[PDB]
Design a protein around this ligand. Sequence first.
Ligand SMILES: Nc1ncnc2c1ncn2[C@@H]1O[C@H](COP(=O)(O)OP(=O)(O)O)[C@@H](O)[C@H]1O
Ligand SMILES: Nc1ncnc2c1ncn2[C@@H]1O[C@H](COP(=O)(O)OP(=O)(O)O)[C@@H](O)[C@H]1O
Ligand SMILES: [Mg+2]
Ligand SMILES: [Mg+2]
Lengths: 74, 160, 118, 371, 371
Amino acid sequence: GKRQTEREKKKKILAERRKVLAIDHLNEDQLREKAKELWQSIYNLEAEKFDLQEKFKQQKYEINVLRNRINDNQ
Amino acid sequence: DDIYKAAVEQLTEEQKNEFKAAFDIFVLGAEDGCISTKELGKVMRMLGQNPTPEELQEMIDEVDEDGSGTVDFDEFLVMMVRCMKDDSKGKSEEELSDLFRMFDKNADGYIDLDELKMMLQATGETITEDDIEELMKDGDKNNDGRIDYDEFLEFMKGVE
Amino acid sequence: ISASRKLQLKTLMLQIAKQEMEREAEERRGEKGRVLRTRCQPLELDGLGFEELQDLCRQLHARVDKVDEERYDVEAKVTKNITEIADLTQKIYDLRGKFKRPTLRRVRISADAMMQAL
Amino acid sequence: TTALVCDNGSGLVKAGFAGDDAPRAVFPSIVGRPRHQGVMVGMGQKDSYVGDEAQSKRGILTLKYPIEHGIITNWDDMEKIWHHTFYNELRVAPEEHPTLLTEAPLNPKANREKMTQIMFETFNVPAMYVAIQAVLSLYASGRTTGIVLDSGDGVTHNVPIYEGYALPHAIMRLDLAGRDLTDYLMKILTERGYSFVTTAEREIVRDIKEKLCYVALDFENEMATAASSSSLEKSYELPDGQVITIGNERFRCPETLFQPSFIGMESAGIHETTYNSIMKCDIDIRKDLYANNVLSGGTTMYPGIADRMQKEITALAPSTMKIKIIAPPERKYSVWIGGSILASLSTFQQMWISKQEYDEAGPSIVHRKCF
Amino acid sequence: TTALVCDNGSGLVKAGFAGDDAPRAVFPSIVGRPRHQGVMVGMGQKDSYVGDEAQSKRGILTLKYPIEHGIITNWDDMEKIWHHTFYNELRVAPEEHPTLLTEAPLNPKANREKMTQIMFETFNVPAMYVAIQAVLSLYASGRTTGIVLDSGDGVTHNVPIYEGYALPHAIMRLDLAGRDLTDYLMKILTERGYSFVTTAEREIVRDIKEKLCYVALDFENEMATAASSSSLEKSYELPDGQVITIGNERFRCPETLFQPSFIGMESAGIHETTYNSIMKCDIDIRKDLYANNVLSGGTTMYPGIADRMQKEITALAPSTMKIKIIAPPERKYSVWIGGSILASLSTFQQMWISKQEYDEAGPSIVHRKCF
Ligand SMILES: Nc1ncnc2c1ncn2[C@@H]1O[C@H](COP(=O)(O)OP(=O)(O)O)[C@@H](O)[C@H]1O
Ligand SMILES: Nc1ncnc2c1ncn2[C@@H]1O[C@H](COP(=O)(O)OP(=O)(O)O)[C@@H](O)[C@H]1O
Ligand SMILES: [Mg+2]
Ligand SMILES: [Mg+2]
């Protein structure tokens, strides 16, 4: 575990997330709007994951501080 | 501060009962009604309330800048009614932790006298002689140059 | 050691710290928007042909896959950090309990209440 | 709701709600039936006065303690004492309050099982828990290590604890306590002419012991001084006049603690059973136990015991270790204060023996995981 | 990024980032579960204290090393030790750092394969490489030839190297090391009255060995001198007082290295397995190996060993060759310093076992070209 289970979860996430790729079957407007909206969605995802990096770094620093605290007990 | 009017209009019966009890004990005749804090401290000590006794004495030696020697109603009355914890919400832990993190750009888990001086420059507060030593008292509870977020939390917890 | 002056000094330091932290968070949000514009480049399609949309959606699928995988990893990191935060919170809470919790109680809760009726 | 921290003890029952500083009601645990005939009609004479009421009518009663040495020898009287404690001294029905009894170490199982069966069937409490009398006294000191000598009135026991891990193989329980000191004092008072025999006069001898006796720093020097000068003879007024003068009986009564050969007991004093209890511990926690020796219990209130014990242990122990004896001024109620602290904890809130658990496993549940 | 130079060892785990002079965190490799019951509630008692934390609470623990003789006998405990080393002593997540473990020569394959499988699956490092503990100690000396005797705490091995070409047929691995010397010292201390039995007191005997024992230049003369005078008896204070006096146990404990018949081992001492390891080499590189004999490892820190070993080898070797014994003052961390130097090299940067390679060939990749 911990190497294929997470792999399986991310694979299923990609499968459900990556929708059908089929473009030249329809009018340009609908597909253009879909592409723009999904690009905006992944832009928001980039912002969210960047904020996650910042927050997780801050909490890692807090973990270091609390490690210093528990070290101060001896 | 000048919250004397707010305190005198905000208090409830629970402590105003003892306030009026000490009032009648104090003012009973042949007095101006100014009510000196000296006898008020003794009366409140007898009545069984639980403030800190030394802080009131230090304030009496310090407060009432007019230097009359008998603090008038507002300041010493507020210090008396300080038996009830009518505080300013006691601030918040997460906000102060964020403050400490913002100050801890050094990323070492502590804020030293250098960062304290930088903060004082940022606010533009008067240079006070208690500095450095105040950090040694509050922040340096172990005398090691280390101060975590809890020392700053209790440094001005519910400050008002 | 003054009392009123020191109280005013400390509360002013608190208020200034809070306002500076708010302004710093506003600056952080501005820099976040700047980074968002820089990396995830704006994509304009003002009157373009079909092949432009084809390329855009292809790059979209590639970037969506890579960013979702990356954020999956980052979310795993955040879950581990949350676990560490909870564990260390329990640790510090137990430390505080050992230090002060026994000292926490209702002393004279009724002993002073009942004085001389007996 | 709030928990009831009762503490049966042997000699004084101490009870009160959890979370306070001092027990609400403290009263001797004696039940005394009248012994004479009684001629006034309609006086409203009861058949048994318990608690502090029988310390005022003790002139015509035959007081008898229901707890001999930690163990309980007379269950009906103990039930009566508990009923009085709940209903008249606290006035709270037990149907709505958890209880936290206390028990000496190394006591018979049947005593503990009967105690829990009574609490669950007669008084019908929601949940009760039994705790060892020394761990509480360690709670009250705010420590987490240390070896506690809890010299009560029934039994003296010496439980060493390190980092929260009790050492079950190093508990040294000795049955010399305040009651034997009262009997020995009553026996040596006869050397001056004062004879106390009645079970009521044992209370007078107990009062003499409490108010006058003290522990000598050095025994032989005090014996020599009291035999030459007369600076020690302190007088005391009986409940009817006829003052008495106690000479070198003052420091000879509590000396029995350090030389149990006086009352014919073989074992070593409380100064040497502590050192033996330490030496049974592992070699790496002996310094901490040396530095954090804790005193508790009523009988350790003699004026000058915290110095005699330190001198004795320093004589026994290696010269390098530091010997420190913690003797808080609130020694008598230390066990109950610790009990209040323990009952007020949130982490402890799921350790109670809930009634449904007792219904499923019977009274033998107390020896199980819920200790 | 920077590489993590970990060095499991057996007795002290030494770790730190590549490119420094000394390991960042050095702490004993012991994992000790508590053994008593524990009565304080909410004390925050963990289920296993590892590393240097269990050398302070060792009074109530049962310490047990997870590495017996180079090989690893308890994989769960070793995983716990590694997790502690990465997260609490260095505070660097392993997802972003290559690792360079070290392994004794002639060890079982399964140990090495399990080590790499753990490092790649549990901690999920980018790339790890396993190196023989003697080549690193040769790196640290700045040589390129020489025969290195790396007498650790688990196992003593003697790898000869010439011009960078290791001689695989001349490695003489002997399983006498510091741990057996600790046990033998603990066994001969009983001849004066001091009995150490508990697994915690093994640490005290280890401290005695480190601080007092020394290697005698000539054994019989020292045995005769210690039996007549009293100029050798050095005293030492236990963790609780009661000083002890070590007589001729001082140089008899480390003498076991040169006469393994003391602990019943058949083989020859470390003074003769080096000469045998040299004589297996070719006839033309024996002079260089004679002149560049290197000492390493912790157990070679006894005061006076670099002279006894030289005297012994000079006795064995031909009279013309010059015998020189390199004993740097930084002997204990020699392997780790060499590991840092090796990890800091540019030529070595493509020898790591990259994760994609492991995914394609399984854990058996370590025996392949990426050694
Ligand atoms: N001030 C005092 N001085 C000397 N002895 C005392 C004092 N107070 C109590 N004692 C002795 O201690 C006994 C009470 O001990 P206590 O701690 O109440 O026992 P328990 O552990 O059963 O509660 C009394 O019998 C009395 O002999
Ligand atoms: N100063 C010293 N004097 C004598 N013996 C020592 C000294 N320091 C360490 N040792 C012995 O060496 C051992 C440590 O060896 P070490 O080199 O850490 O082994 P490893 O190869 O597993 O790291 C200890 O168990 C101790 O017995
Ligand atoms: Mg008691
Ligand atoms: Mg080694």
